[PDB]
Symmetry: C3
Subunit: 115 residues, 3 copies
């Protein structure tokens, strides 16, 4: 229906704060958390993966390489899955952009220890 | 409708015998052979591939790597495609689990001659 | 509805000339340009990619490796995307087959400078 699950009380507060973009006027809302869950199940991917910091990582991994080959439907996903994942880990970005940079750098560190 | 095609007379006998799980009470039935064919065509994959030992291998190959990234919809597939494939090859497992081990080991042998 | 967009006036002329096959009697028509656009959006891929020589390349890249693992739905795509791409680049093949050879050879050249 429209209840909490993916994000807890504390996460919800920050979530509503985070904005979809750095230079916008539309904060994040449950509409985005559910909008992704629906598109997820469509790709044979349960929405529960978003409720777990581990499940999200698995999703971003498939969408990562499918960022250029993927379509708009995939782009939006990476946006939500990003801001959400950051919440489950620790990163408390203000927008969806900052979340992309953080996750982008974290991957660059592993490159040195996984080349 | 509900006739034979993927599995012949002899294969049908063994199929009905094989169980979906090692510790269960629900043997295999045509319902599972058709249930997969439907999900197959959905992924741009003709159900006929299951009627051929060659087609199955091609399917298990894509689902193999998509076992962790894939969703529940993919899991069930690997289960049926497994028990079925084993029938077309030679392996006559009793459950779906044994089929996974057999196919798992067969792949380990090639690793030594394809590393 | 049924207007021009992907192929311009000049491209349209050649398009209608090109045949789906070398030994057939069914030339190409808008029906094929739209038929693909529909299947594209289904895979999270905007149909606009076909209107751009760059977008097409990105599509053929994903379908390339998915030529054997992919289903019939993918085959038809590679057929249209091929004849179309050739138009945006320069190749003016007469059928869909010739388009496959041209794109096949072009990739062989890069192999020598990208092995
Ligand atoms: C007399 C009254 C006259 C005024 C009323 C006349 C109509 C009127 O309202 O103004 C037109 C428009 C603003 O209205 P408008 O609804 O088109 O605003 C843009 C629209 O929402 C886009 O979808 C946004 O980009 P995206 O979805 O996030 O990609 C874009 O954001 P930004 O990201 O740009 O901030 C928004 O500016 O002005 C411009 O700034 C366009 C500059 C080009 C910018 C577009 C290039 C991104
Ligand atoms: C049962 C029916 C249920 C469906 C109807 C329920 C409501 C519904 O329509 O879906 C919600 C929404 C799409 O609708 P929605 O109008 O909110 O679409 C977004 C909105 O226009 C933003 O302003 C765009 O960013 P910007 O102005 O250019 O910055 C953003 O573009 P992209 O640039 O993201 O492509 C658009 O996706 O889904 C998502 O994809 C959000 C993922 C987070 C992405 C936002 C992070 C940028
Ligand atoms: C007074 C009468 C009181 C009795 C009636 C009260 C209700 C009652 O019938 O008993 C409860 C239940 C058995 O009934 P219940 O329908 O829940 O049985 C389980 C259910 O079908 C699961 O979906 C099966 O796992 P999966 O889909 O294949 O994954 C699981 O199989 P196994 O694979 O476990 O054999 C089944 O046991 O007992 C337990 O054994 C649970 C232990 C935890 C096991 C679950 C962890 C897998
Ligand atoms: C037009 C509508 C047609 C659709 C309605 C037609 C009937 C229909 O509903 O679909 C059939 C069936 C799903 O329904 P169905 O209730 O049989 O689902 C399975 C059943 O509950 C088993 O007991 C589960 O295993 P276990 O108790 O935990 O061991 C198994 O889980 P997984 O662990 O497999 O996820 C479940 O999938 O499809 C398949 O996926 C079978 C693939 C073989 C998988 C079985 C091998 C484990
Ligand atoms: C008294 C009147 C009797 C005559 C009326 C009796 C019925 C009658 O019309 O003739 C039968 C048939 C021609 O008619 P028919 O509609 O079946 O023609 C074939 C049909 O359209 C296939 O789908 C085409 O292959 P694909 O979709 O592109 O793959 C095939 O093309 P090609 O690519 O073969 O040119 C077509 O020939 O004859 C043969 O040539 C078959 C030889 C085997 C060829 C099939 C192997 C590809
Ligand atoms: C809203 C509903 C809209 C849908 C209804 C609108 C009309 C509609 O039905 O779809 C159009 C068409 C499929 O229908 P359509 O009857 O034209 O199908 C093709 C036709 O039979 C050819 O003769 C076949 O080649 P050949 O005789 O064996 O040589 C070709 O096979 P393949 O060998 O290609 O598999 C068939 O796909 O789509 C495409 O895939 C064309 C892609 C270009 C492929 C052609 C290049 C070979
Ligand atoms: C929002 O309220 C989340 C609930 C998701 C919808 C559940 C629908 C009801 C479950 C039982 C119906 C199954 C019919 C046998
Ligand atoms: C079970 O009976 C397997 C048959 C699959 C359904 C076939 C449907 C009938 C074929 C002709 C209908 C096409 C309409 C032009
Ligand atoms: C063929 O004519 C190409 C046009 C594609 C269909 C567009 C449908 C009309 C657009 C506005 C409808 C949206 C409802 C708010």
């Amino acid at each position: 229906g429209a209840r909490a699950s993916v994000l807890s009380g504390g996460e919800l507060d920050k979530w509503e704060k985070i904005r979809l973009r750095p230079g916008g006027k539309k904060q994040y809302k449950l509409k985005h958390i559910v909008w992704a869950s629906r598109e997820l199940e469509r790709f044979a991917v349960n929405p529960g993966l978003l409720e777990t910091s581990e499940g999200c990582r698995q999703i971003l991994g498939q969408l990562q390489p499918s960022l250029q080959t993927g379509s708009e439907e995939l782009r939006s996903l990476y946006n939500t899955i990003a801001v959400l994942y950051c919440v489950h880990q620790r990163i408390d970005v203000k927008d969806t952009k900052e979340a992309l940079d953080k996750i982008e750098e974290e991957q660059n560190k592993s490159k040195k220890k996984a080349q």
